[PDB]
Amino acid sequence: GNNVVVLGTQWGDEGKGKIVDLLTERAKYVVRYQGGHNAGHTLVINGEKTVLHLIPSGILRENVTSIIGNGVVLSPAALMKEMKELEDRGIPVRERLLLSEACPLILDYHVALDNAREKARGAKAIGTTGRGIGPAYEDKVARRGLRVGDLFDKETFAEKLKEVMEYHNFQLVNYYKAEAVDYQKVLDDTMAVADILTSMVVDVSDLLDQARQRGDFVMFEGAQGTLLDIDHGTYPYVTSSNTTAGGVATGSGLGPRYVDYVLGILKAYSTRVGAGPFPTELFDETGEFLCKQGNEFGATTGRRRRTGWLDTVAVRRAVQLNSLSGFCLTKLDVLDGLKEVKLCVAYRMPDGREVTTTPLAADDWKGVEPIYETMPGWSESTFGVKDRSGLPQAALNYIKRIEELTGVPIDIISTGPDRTETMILRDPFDA
């Protein structure tokens, strides 16, 4: 399919950046349909790293026009930050990148708010990345926010800005007893980058309609993961946007009927950053082993990531939700050395029932325990293996049972962080 969707089947941090960069070879466009700079999509070409946060993972490819769609909450400061960094490394970000005038803006006050609300939660803190994501999405739905296109008239912007900040500060100071963030300062910072963004502005939905009509290879890149969906996730321990493929047509403008292949990025084991349910969570050396080996530390915050065995149940939901066409198995080599391996095949409900369906809101997950199928590990090395013939029978079996369990094929297998340390058993643009 020309229009391929690559998204996180778990809780984010499955390894999407690498796959977007990988598959972008034949693509003319890469589009982010949601999230913000809360992400940390890491690219490694020949061993040279690049951590992307807001910038689409097709930024290091001459042929690709990277696009930040309307669904995405844009932080002027972060964008400017990333560009220079890439520009200093030979990537003409401004010739490659495009953005929607529809994109919500994230400003100083959104972070202050993001932090007050979090603190306000005491023990019940979500573990948000503290980037004003939550608040930015709020102001939007409220029809009170600033989008990219408001910079079109700096006069009315400053007026609109004064009004909105006037409002937020009363709450910051008067309710949260927090300091007020200054209007003139945020104004000054904003209006100093205004001209840049506005020049990257294009009609994204009309744009993609033309590519589709011509048959161009479009790649929509997701951030976060299925279980962090604002609707379908473990509410309220979720992100503020829709991380399920449906957010593709809403935050890009593409016809829902034009999505061709939904590629699910599946890490060989689970991880979570931020508070929230996680059945297959391990608190033993096996879980610490995964931490040290998969190098599970937040790429935006640097927070230690919680680890666990693969959960085919939370995954099976992701499957149905995104109409996944196939999987890309990431970090399988992190399993090397393990004796026994475990996938979660079902959940034991607190009332004694056994189910193969996940609960919904965070509360509903309470006494839910995991049922596993233990499998033999493999001492052999898997790192860098670019073919199955090099994958040991166990590894191969683990993979197959996963397909069997989910009914979805492991189309690509990633055996290392570098672009080349991978296997494409089926190409999404082909099949």
Ligand X SMILES: O=CN(O)CC(=O)O
Pick between residue 90 and residue 302 the one whose CB is nearest to ligand X.
302
- Residue 232 known to be catalytic: no
> What b/e sequence results for 243-268 when a residue is b if at least 16 CB atoms lie within 10 Å of its CB, and e otherwise?
bbbbbbbbbbbbeeebbebbbbbbbb
Q: Which stretch binds a copy of itself (CB under 8 A): 203-211, 327-335, 338-346, 380-388?
A: 203-211
Give dist(CA 418, CA 380) in Å, integer: 20
Interface with ligand X, residue 34, by CB under 6 A = no
Closest CB to ligand X among 76 and 294? 294
Is 290 a binding residue for ligand X by CB under 6 A? The answer is no
Contacts of 332 (CB under 8 A, 6+ apart): 268, 382, 391, 395, 398, 399, 413, 414, 415
Nearer to ligand IMP, 25 or 231 (CB): 231
DSSP class per residue in 28-88? SEEEE-S--TT--EEEEETTEEEEESSS-TTTT-TT-EEEE-TTS-B-HHHHHHHHHHHHT
CA separation for the pair 13, 282 (Å, rounded): 17
**Paired tokens of 240:** 């503020």
Q: Which helix (H) or strand (E) holds 19?
A: helix 16-23
CB 386 within 8 A of CB 415: yes
Using rule CB under 8 A, residue 119 touches a copy of itself: no
Cα separation, 82 vs 305, in Å, equals: 24
User: Taking CB within 5 to 8 Å according to partner kind, which of a copy of itself, ligand X, ligand IMP, none is near residue 93?
Assistant: none
Interaction between residue 152 and a copy of itself (CB under 8 A): yes
User: Residue 19 or residue 299: which is nearer to ligand X going by CB?
Assistant: 299
State how far the Cα of 79 lies from the Cα of 54, in Å rounded to an integer.
Answer: 7
Work out whether strand 306-308 and strand 270-272 pair parallel, antiparallel, or are unpaired: antiparallel
Binding of ligand IMP at residue 134 (CB under 6 A)? yes
Binder of ligand X out of 298, 337, 392, 409 (CB under 6 A): 298
DSSP class per residue in 230-286? TTTSSTTSS-SS--STHHHHHTT---GGG--EEEEEEESSEEE-SSS--TTB--SHH
The amino acid occupying position 272 is R
Catalytic residue among 37, 41, 53, 232: 41
Answer yes or no: are the C-beta atoms of 232 and 321 closer than 8 Å: yes
Q: What is the closest distance, in whole angstroms, from the C-beta atom of residue 276 to ligand IMP in the complex?
A: 6
41 tagged catalytic: yes
128 binding ligand IMP? (CB under 6 A): yes
Among 28, 303, 348, 386, binds ligand X (CB under 6 A): 303
**Residues of the binding site:** 12-18, 38-42, 129, 143, 224, 239, 299-305, 331-333, 414-416
Of 262 and 275, the one with the shorter C-beta distance to ligand IMP is: 275
Q: Does 239 bind ligand X (CB under 6 A)?
A: no
Cβ neighbours of residue 251 closer than 8 Å, sequence gap 6 or more? 32, 33, 34, 69, 70, 71, 72, 241, 242
Give the nearest distance from C-beta 39 to ligand IMP in angstroms: 4
- Lay out the site mask for a copy of itself across 60-99 (x = CB under 8 A, - = otherwise): ----------xx----------------------------
Which residues of this protein are in contact with a copy of itself, per CB under 8 A? Answer: 5, 70-71, 101-102, 117, 126, 134-135, 137-138, 140-144, 147, 149-150, 152-153, 156, 167, 170-171, 174-175, 203, 205-206, 209, 230-232, 235-238, 240, 242, 244-251, 253-259, 262, 317, 320-323, 325, 357, 360-361, 363-364
Residues at the interface with ligand X (CB under 6 A): 13, 39-40, 129, 273, 298-301, 303
Q: Which residues bind ligand IMP (CB under 6 A)?
A: 11-13, 38-39, 126-129, 133-134, 223-224, 228, 237, 239-240, 273-274
Active site members: 13, 41
